[PDB]
Amino acid sequence: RRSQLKQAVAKMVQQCCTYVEEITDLPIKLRLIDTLRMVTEGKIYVEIERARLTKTLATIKEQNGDVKEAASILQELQVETYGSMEKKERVEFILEQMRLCLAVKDYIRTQIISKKINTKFFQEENTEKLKLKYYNLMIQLDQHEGSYLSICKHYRAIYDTPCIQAESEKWQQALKSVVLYVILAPFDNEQSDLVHRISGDKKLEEIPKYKDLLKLFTTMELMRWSTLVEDYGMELRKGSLESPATDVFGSTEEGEKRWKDLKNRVVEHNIRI
Amino acid sequence: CTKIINADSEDPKYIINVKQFAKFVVDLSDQVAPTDIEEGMRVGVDRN
């Protein structure tokens, strides 16, 4: 008989989806809440409470990204560690929780559930590339939260799909975003081995910026910062590419901090040589 | 003294366990009759 109730509940979720488009927020949320109470014991066999997660995602839009609504999605998604029998979409739902934490803008808040993200693994190399398409979203989340060396570690993972796309700007940007990490990342044994591996790529060779980036990779004696500002005026606004320029001097929070880092890393280069 | 465990066609190559030493593939001595030597029979083998 519980299975019969579940069959009725499966019909309810389809009706609730039609209701969500059919009626305004106040009636639809009440209907979703009423089914939610009945299926508190019931597992999310498909979208049984995944629809509730979509409903809170809808509430976030209704509440103009209210933090409490984002927290409501966070707690329910946190509850659904193994709630959904399907695996691929369940991992995607965990990513949806993470994006809301990034929306909080605490940076640490995304990292707090990034530990839950740490449990998620092998999105890349999954069959059909569907998980790889999802994998692009997970790496995309990493930015300020990832370390300057780490952003490159994710950007190289993002680079594979645009390289398959071979977009004139996006594929070039995908390689460019990984290469720009060296300017903002401090010298290390790991940094040197990584810069050599990225250097010499045929696609990278085409980009003019890669020629500018080679100066740090080689000892190159000393590169004056004032000369670099003339050389990297294009980086601020290429007008042809500039697609990964956000990674460097995008603006202030992720740009001016990068501007100071470039001066520091070249100053570090001057002392090392 | 040693104990025979088996015999082979053509050259007999009888293999004998000495009593603690090893399985020795020893051919029959020149002054012996092959029929007289028998499988599962105690035998005396000169070391030299």
Binding site: Y82, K115, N118, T119 | -
Partner: protein, 375 residues
């Protein structure tokens, strides 16, 4: 004319192929002569490094000679405990080669199998819930436990009815974590020394450390040659001392790679109260007797590798005998196969399962050789 000359050339080509075979025979003879020169090397184990120049070693037969390394012998890889080749006359190290049959060690290594089926006997209400939850959090993130500062719980105890959760679901956990497991029956661990049992367990723990996913399973921990020895004049509670030693090994000295030494065994008659304290045994999971509806599900899983007439009411067969044992339900299926073997029926009719269930009901009534009770 020209065609006849071509045929003669073909015969010459066949002769050339025979010449190539003769050359191969000459190459084989050259290899055999080269082989004859080598005189072999005594096989021995390095007891210790007396000095960089000389390492003390013992030949396998037993005489020990101090020996010196040869050319590029990689003395770093010549560390004591490595099998070595010793010159027959020179008696000096020639090469480092590690080959050990290790039959007892193999029992202590990866001998235990893992059951691929997620639900061989079903009954996964807490088996894929509480048992999975406690092990998964350290396995996924030991560092998160480190942020809390609590030592990740080393192990959990699956106290349960014998056979239903003991014979089966012992290796089902291995599929749940998707890795092969090490079975601590302890029969291999206790061989000729009561003291060595803890040391051999430490060796198994090191083997467990080698694979981070692999989880130590203390299945049948009480089981031993004859019967487990409790405190007594002839034999004392060596196993209880090993359990106290195990607690020391589990926390501090031997905890790494987020490997869980779960004591998931209902075999021990007595459970240490100190072990029950949070840490050594943070949580205990209780396997439960089947709900009969659950037994019907178990019978279906057991019926999966079965050819049947198709007119089978499994619920009626399950209702007919309340075996309450996953092994007993598996027995019902096997006995039904025996009934099918009678009369040469490849298919098994529902009656054959019911006849087997009646025989199993008699087996359920009479049981022997069970002396293991949790707590």
């Amino acid at each position: 004319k020209l065609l006849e000359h071509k045929e003669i050339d073909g015969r010459l080509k066949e002769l050339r192929e025979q010449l190539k075979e003769l050359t191969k025979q000459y190459e084989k003879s050259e290899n055999d002569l080269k082989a004859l020169q080598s005189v072999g090397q005594i096989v021995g184990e390095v007891l210790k490094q007396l000095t960089e120049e000389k390492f003390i070693v013992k030949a396998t037969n037993g005489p020990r000679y101090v020996v010196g390394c040869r050319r590029q012998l990689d003395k770093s890889k010549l560390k004591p405990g490595t099998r070595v080749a010793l010159d027959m006359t020179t008696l000096t190290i020639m090469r480092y080669l590690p080959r050990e049959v290790d039959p007892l060690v193999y029992n202590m290594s990866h001998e235990d199998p893992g059951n691929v089926s997620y639900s061989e006997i079903g009954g996964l209400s807490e088996q894929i819930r509480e048992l999975r939850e406690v092990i998964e959090l350290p396995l996924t993130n030991p560092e998160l436990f480190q942020r809390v500062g609590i030592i990740p719980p080393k192990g959990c105890l699956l106290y349960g009815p014998p056979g239903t959760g003991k014979t089966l679901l012992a290796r089902a956990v291995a599929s749940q974590l998707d890795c092969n497991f090490l079975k601590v029956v302890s029969s291999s661990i206790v061989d000729k020394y009561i003291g060595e049992s803890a040391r051999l367990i430490r060796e198994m723990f090191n083997y467990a450390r080698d694979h981070q996913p692999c989880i130590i399973f203390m299945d049948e921990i009480d089981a031993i040659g004859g019967r487990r020895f409790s405190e007594g004049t002839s034999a004392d509670r060596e196993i209880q001392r090993t359990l106290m030693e195990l607690l020391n090994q589990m926390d501090g000295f031997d905890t790494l790679h987020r490997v869980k030494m779960i004591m998931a065994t209902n075999r021990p008659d007595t459970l240490d109260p100190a072990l029950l304290r949070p840490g050594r045994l943070d949580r205990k999971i209780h396997i439960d007797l089947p709900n009969e509806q659950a037994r019907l599900d178990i019978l279906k899983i057991h019926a999966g590798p079965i050819t049947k007439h198709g007119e089978i009411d499994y619920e009626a067969i399950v209702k007919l005998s309340d075996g309450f044992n996953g092994a007993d339900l598996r027995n019902v299926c096997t006995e039904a196969g025996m009934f099918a073997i009678r009369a040469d029926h490849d298919f098994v009719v529902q009656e054959d399962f019911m006849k087997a269930v009646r025989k199993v009901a008699d087996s359920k009534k009479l049981e022997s050789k069970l002396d293991y009770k949790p707590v």
